């Protein structure tokens, strides 16, 4: 019963990550395969998420954009492209985006 449900979310994870392409993209680009509700999107492509069910920390997170100030950033990842106003919310310094 429970094992079936745990399997059941797994395909739901595939549906959440835009089918196969998004799932392969995020796992090879962020090592994260967990999907949460959309919380915001800046003027950069920095698509943000949030999931209160996860424990403190990983409960809100990010996958970074592909284009940052005329720089390729699909493979590379840095924590500094986060804009200041959203840097406040992401570090849980304020829980309202």
Partner 1 sequence: MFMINILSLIIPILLAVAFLTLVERKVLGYMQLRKGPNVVGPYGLLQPIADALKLVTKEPLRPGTSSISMFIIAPILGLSLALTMWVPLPMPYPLINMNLGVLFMLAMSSLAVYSILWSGWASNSKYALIGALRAVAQTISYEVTLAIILLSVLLMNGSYTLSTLITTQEHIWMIFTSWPLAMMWFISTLAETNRAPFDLTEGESELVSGFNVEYAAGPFAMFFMAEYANIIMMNAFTAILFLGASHDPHTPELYTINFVLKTLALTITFLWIRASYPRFRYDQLMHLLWKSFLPLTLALCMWHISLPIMTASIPPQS
Partner 2 sequence: RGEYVVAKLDDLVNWARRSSLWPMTFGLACCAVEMMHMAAPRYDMDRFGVVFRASPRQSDVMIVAGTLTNKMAPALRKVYDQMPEPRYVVSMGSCANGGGYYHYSYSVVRGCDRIVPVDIYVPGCPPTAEALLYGILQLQRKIKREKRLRIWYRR
Please give the residue ranges that form the binding site for partner 1 (CB under 8 A): 27-28, 31
Contact range with partner 2 by CB under 8 A, out of 13-21, 43-51, 61-69, 78-86 = 78-86
Q: Going by DSSP bridges, is the β-strand pair 37-41/47-50 parallel, antiparallel, or unpaired?
A: antiparallel
**Do 27 and 33 form a contact (C-beta atoms < 8 A)?**
yes
Of 58, 56, 57, 40, nearest in space to 48 by CA: 40
Choose the contact partner of 7 out of partner 2, ligand CDL, partner 1, none; CB within 5 to 8 A by kind.
Answer: ligand CDL
Of 17, 30, 37, 22, nearest in space to 63 by CA: 30
CA gap 35, 39 in Å, rounded: 12
Contact range with ligand CDL by CB under 6 A, out of 1-9, 15-23, 77-85, 86-94 = 1-9
Binding partner 2 by CB under 8 A: which of 77, 83, 87, 95?
77
Q: Which residues bind ligand CDL (CB under 6 A)?
A: 2-3, 6-7, 9-10, 13, 33
């Amino acid at each position: 019963m429970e094992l079936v449900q745990v399997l059941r979310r797994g395909l739901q994870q595939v549906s959440g990550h835009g089918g196969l392409r998004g799932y392969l993209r995020v796992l090879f680009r962020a090592n994260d395969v967990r999907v949460g509700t959309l919380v915001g999107e800046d003027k950069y492509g920095n698509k943000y998420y949030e999931d209160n069910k996860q424990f403190f920390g990983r409960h809100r997170w990010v996958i970074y954009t592909t284009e940052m100030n005329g720089r390729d950033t699909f493979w590379d990842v840095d924590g500094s492209m986060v804009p200041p106003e959203w840097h406040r919310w992401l570090h849980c310094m304020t829980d309202d985006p």
